């Protein structure tokens with residue numbers, strides 16, 4: 001069982017509803033993220049301005065946070081290509097996946113069948129290879145832009161000789177060393193899972209560019225520290241979609257029978273079975289806080305809606321003319337999007353199909369972090385407020 | 387419609403029954419080649435020595451000589467992985483394709499789903515990349531081995547300064563120049579489709595290594611000539627499977643209703659419709675000559691049968707133990723085959739999964755070509771009979 005919402009044109013969806021063991025339900029990353037695609041489709045399908053006589057449908061599938069399970073799920077998006085000899089739908093594009101390895105596997109199949117993809121959460125730098133991942137685009141910037149911004153910070157501050165402190169931790173240090181111009185890296189000490197103040201005491205002695213996420217940063221805290229007193233942090237520009245909060249909060253078992261995994265979500269966050277009541281409120285009988293990449297789910301869906309809106313204006317008086325265009329033509333319309341997102345900020349794709357890096361810069365200057373500048377597209381607007 | 391032959395274990399088949407426009411029926415390359423897989427499966431399923439209580443089934447699909455049509459056909463081999471919510475069979479391996487571009491596209495999909503492939507006709511050197519084409523193996527040697535043998539001929543003869551005379555023509559000249567050791571290439575003149583004796587008159591003037599196939603060689607004919615008086619040719623060791631000739635010759639419309647494309651084959655080669663008789667003999671009312679790669683179809687099928695035979699001996703008293711092994715385990719058993727083929731010659735795979743090059747060497751020494759040696763695995767046994 002999966003979510004199948006009828007429409008004139010269908011958008012494939014890949015969400016990690018359950019974690020890898022399949023397994024148990026993932027509250028924020030699965031349910032909020034998928035419901036955001038449903039909320040986005042509810043918005044678009046209430047909107048007379050975008051896709052007027054075209055209802056956007058959805059085939060939303062769980063990935064179980066495992067790339068192999070997702071690859072067998074992706075086949076659902078290509079059923080219409082299988083010959084019948086033993087209710088058709090055309091999946092024009094796919095919104096997902098969440099978790100870069102899953103997206104890579106999924107890109108490997110979609111590429112062959114010329115079906116565009118837009119990830120809302122996959123951040124891996126491998127995915128930036130527009131030849132290998134021909135049909136992949138994303139609304140999140142690759143983690144490489146974070147490191148590029150860190151080079152710019154260091155260089156503008158004139159650090160020169162800086163020390164750098166899993167799959168993510170290394171990739172940051174790799175991207176940072178690659179940008180030369182230039183500067184030299186001294187001691188590149190590592191910190192894995194499971195020294196005690198020894199690494200902190202050994203601060204090169206000849207700035208520290210920390211690539212440790214996310215509770216690892218708190219463990220470390222005379223010398224300057226730059227991590228992704230007077231420490232500098234690079235952060236993404238994050239936002240809440242209030243419209244979606246009213247939607248998810250109002251979700252009960254009675255009004256949300258379309259989400260096949262909602263009753264399963266109901267048991268989890270409420271610590272009850274099916275003893276439970278079945279008459280509680282999300283923001284009342286639990287601690288609700290909207291998942292950070294929900295903004296990127298909506299943005300991913302809208303990118304595709306706008307791309308499909310432009311195509312319909314150019315090809316229809318879903319007319320048959322539109323029905324025989326194919327993904328390579330849809331990719332053009334996808335890559336040419338430039339519109340204001342759910343957070344307010346514009347949605348665009350670079351040459352490789354990546355979202356440009358938009359980061360705020362803070363320094364530990366009643367103390368706390370003071371906004372010391374920002375990083376946009378390929379520029380560093382640093383201030384002398386340090 | 388496609389050929390579906392029931393069995394305990396199923397082998398996928400890809401054959402160019404029709405040419406690219408789909409299109410009209412291809413007599414030798416489609417019908418003989420597919421019927422050879424049916425004949426092979428008839429042999430194995432009559433054999434008490436190979437797969438005793440295991441019937442080898444087949445899902446044989448037409449590729450229409452177009453890689454995109456074949457990619458949508460390949461999905462048939464992965465139907466069992468598609469979830470049911472809107473008669474199962476497990477395709478353990480695929481015999482095909484014919485035409486390297488088709489095999490490349492097919493390898494790109496099968497790789498993902500860990501399903502082994504064995505081509506009987508795809509000769510392209512790209513396919514030799516055991517990392518990129520992880521699950522691909524072939525019973526035909528890459529065209530690169532022909533060029534390697536040509537370097538060995540030249541070098542043993544001490545030519546030193548030799549001149550070299552589509553996708554194939556260039557690939558040979560590319561593979562020949564790459565092997566250095568070493569020798570130098572003088573004038574590398576080209577001959578496309580649609581000079582007249584001018585290129586023949588200009589024979590460097592400072593041996594000619596001809597990479598022109600197949601009617602182009604006759605057009606060219608003081609100096610020495612080596613092409614793939616006293617000219618040297620490199621040829622593959624070819625053979626007829628007499629067992630198959632009796633089979634195809636005896637094929638009528640009444641006894642061959644399992645071949646969905648046979649009645650279509652009946653119209654073509656006999657210049658009649660459905661005025662026709664429907665009571666004629668293949669070798670009698672037409673010119674019959676067995677397609678050259680039929681030997682490689684049987685060999686491809688047997689490779690897989692032997693691989694499945696060994697697996698059954700190691701895992702069964704098709705037991706469930708065998709059913710959950712998967713292609714990566716079947717690939718091991720595929721790559722370890724060493725058995726005598728339908729032509730008599732042994733069937734083995736190198737490190738990259740390629741069949742070793744086995745070529746005979748002839749020289750224009752009542753004149754004609756005289757057997758002057760051979761080339762095997764990675765060795766050149768040349769004779770002083772020139």
Ligand SMILES: N[C@](CC1c2ccccc2Oc2ccccc21)(C(=O)O)[C@H]1C[C@@H]1C(=O)O
Nearest residue numbers: 029098099100101121122123124167168213
């Ligand atoms: N953004 C993620 C995360 C990025 C990452 C990249 C590769 C491997 C693991 C990995 O996990 C971490 C851990 C700490 C910091 C950044 C990452 C992605 O996979 O792209 C995506 C799964 C997360 C989601 O947002 O659902």
Ligand SMILES: N[C@](CC1c2ccccc2Oc2ccccc21)(C(=O)O)[C@H]1C[C@@H]1C(=O)O
Nearest residue numbers: 415484485486487507508509510553554599
């Ligand atoms: N063996 C082929 C042929 C090889 C080739 C390789 C690449 C492109 C075209 C091409 O056509 C020629 C022409 C002349 C000499 C060698 C080739 C393959 O594609 O591998 C395969 C289709 C033929 C079959 O045997 O069904």
Ligand SMILES: [Mg+2]
Nearest residue numbers: 044045047048
């Ligand atoms: Mg609307």
Ligand SMILES: [Mg+2]
Nearest residue numbers: 430431433434
């Ligand atoms: Mg038998």
